A paper describes a structure:
FNR is a flavoenzyme that contains a noncovalently bound flavin adenine dinucleotide (FAD) as a prosthetic group. It catalyzes redox reactions between Fd and NAD(P)H. The redox-active component is the isoalloxazine ring of FAD, which undergoes transitions among three states: fully oxidized (FAD), semiquinone (; partially reduced) and hydroquinone (FADH2; fully reduced). In root plastids, which lack PS I, R-FNR reduces nonphotosynthetic Fd by oxidizing NADPH from the oxidative pentose phosphate pathway.
Previous X-ray structural studies of oxidized FNR have not accounted for the potential partial reduction caused by X-ray irradiation. To limit the reduction rate to less than 10%, it was necessary to keep the X-ray dose below 0.11 MGy. Consequently, X-ray diffraction data for wtFNRoxi crystals were collected using multiple irradiation points within a single crystal to minimize the dose. The absorbed dose during the diffraction experiment was calculated using RADDOSE-3D and estimated to be 0.097 MGy, meeting the required threshold. The X-ray structures of wild-type FNR in oxidized and reduced states were refined to 1.15 and 1.10 Å resolution, respectively, revealing no large structural changes in the main-chain backbones. However, the Fo(wtFNRoxi) − Fo(wtFNRred) difference map revealed subtle but significant changes localized around the FAD/FADH2 moiety, highlighting the structural impact of FAD reduction.
Residue numbers in the entry: 1009 to 1317
Write the structure that this text describes.
């Protein structure tokens, strides 16, 4: 049974909001909560941040918020810090189902000397640590929203959406899937196939796993979910198990879905992409197809959606 969301006037806009707040005059939002998403064996912390924007900074699923961390820009004296962008991990209604909050999925960027292993906090990532160090009531300078690459194509409510994430790249897909399955959105009744592939380092590094597993039990004919755990699993050619390796386990199903018009999405750190391309090229070759020609047609058909960073 789908969760009631409000206010339904968030469905009325026909275009996504863009640059509602700009860096020189951000919106001062308020932290609701910060929690770690990961267990003790995870190589680093990733946190879920809930931000009260008061309904002043609405967005569509797949967009990003900008955050301006405090302090001076180290490269421009007297100037504010540069915006850092974060894929929004919530639906437009947010985790409180009220249209007032949005959420981020933030990996702490921590510096370690490559030899001594000693941490150096002075070289840690500024905005990511600022966010994961935040507490209820803290203020955040919010900009945006921005981005259109990862908007969800809703013209066909029975479309197929193949979602390929590593790490924090799961963020837009958390939003897609809540809109598809969790929330009572009368004007978007999804009856297609949503297929999430997620690569992380180990079980303790999984993000939102209980939520995704719940969809398998609630929507077994509309949702599929496959995981790759790089430090705990090995591919058939015995490298570490990466998200491209799990795609290959479903080579024929995936290529048939693409040929049938499926959308495919990639999100996360950009290092995930060269290997995914290598696997797709090899899968195509085994089928007697040219991956170059296939990718050109997927791009021409607007089926190929990549936001990596
Ligand atoms: C569209 C988009 C969406 C994104 N979505 C997400 C998301 O959902 N989640 C997420 O976590 N990130 C996301 N990012 C990345 C995010 O914008 C930031 O780049 C990231 O959080 C790091 O920012 P920071 O301020 O913490 O690090 P910065 O302060 O910008 O530092 C960058 C890196 O340099 C390192 N560093 C700094 N000084 C030194 C030094 N002297 N020597 C060596 N190393 C040094 C830091 O440790 C860090 O790793 C996204 C990016 C884009 C473009």
């Amino acid at each position: 049974s789908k969760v009631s969301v409000a206010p339904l006037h968030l469905e009325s806009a026909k275009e996504p909001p863009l640059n509602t707040y700009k860096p020189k005059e951000p919106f001062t939002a308020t932290i609701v909560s910060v929690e770690s998403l990961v267990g003790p064996k995870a190589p680093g912390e990733t946190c879920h941040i809930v931000i009260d924007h008061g309904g002043n900074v609405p967005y569509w699923e797949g967009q990003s918020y900008g955050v301006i961390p405090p302090g001076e820009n180290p490269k421009k004296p007297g100037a504010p810090q540069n915006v850092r962008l974060y894929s929004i991990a919530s639906t437009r209604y947010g985790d409180n189902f009220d249209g007032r909050t949005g959420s981020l999925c933030v990996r702490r960027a921590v510096y370690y000397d490559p030899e001594t292993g000693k941490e150096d906090p002075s070289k840690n990532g500024v905005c990511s640590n600022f966010l994961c160090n935040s507490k209820p009531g803290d203020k955040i300078q919010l900009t945006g929203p921005s981005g259109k690459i990862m908007l969800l194509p809703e013209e066909d409510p029975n479309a197929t959406h193949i979602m390929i994430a590593t790490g924090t790249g799961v963020a837009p897909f958390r939003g897609y899937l809540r809109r598809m399955f969790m929330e009572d959105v009368p004007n978007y009744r999804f009856g297609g196939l949503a297929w999430l592939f997620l690569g992380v380092a180990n079980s303790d590094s999984l993000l939102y796993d209980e939520e995704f597993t719940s969809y398998l039990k609630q929507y077994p004919d509309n949702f599929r979910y496959d995981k790759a755990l790089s430090r705990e699993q090995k591919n058939r050619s015995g490298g570490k198990m990466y998200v491209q390796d799990k795609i290959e386990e479903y080579s024929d199903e995936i290529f048939k879905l693409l040929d049938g018009g499926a959308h495919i999405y990639f999100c996360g750190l950009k290092g995930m992409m060269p290997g995914i391309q290598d696997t797709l090229k090899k899968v195509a070759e085994r089928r007697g197809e040219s991956w170059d020609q296939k990718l050109a047609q997927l791009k021409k058909n607007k089926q190929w959606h990549v936001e990596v960073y």
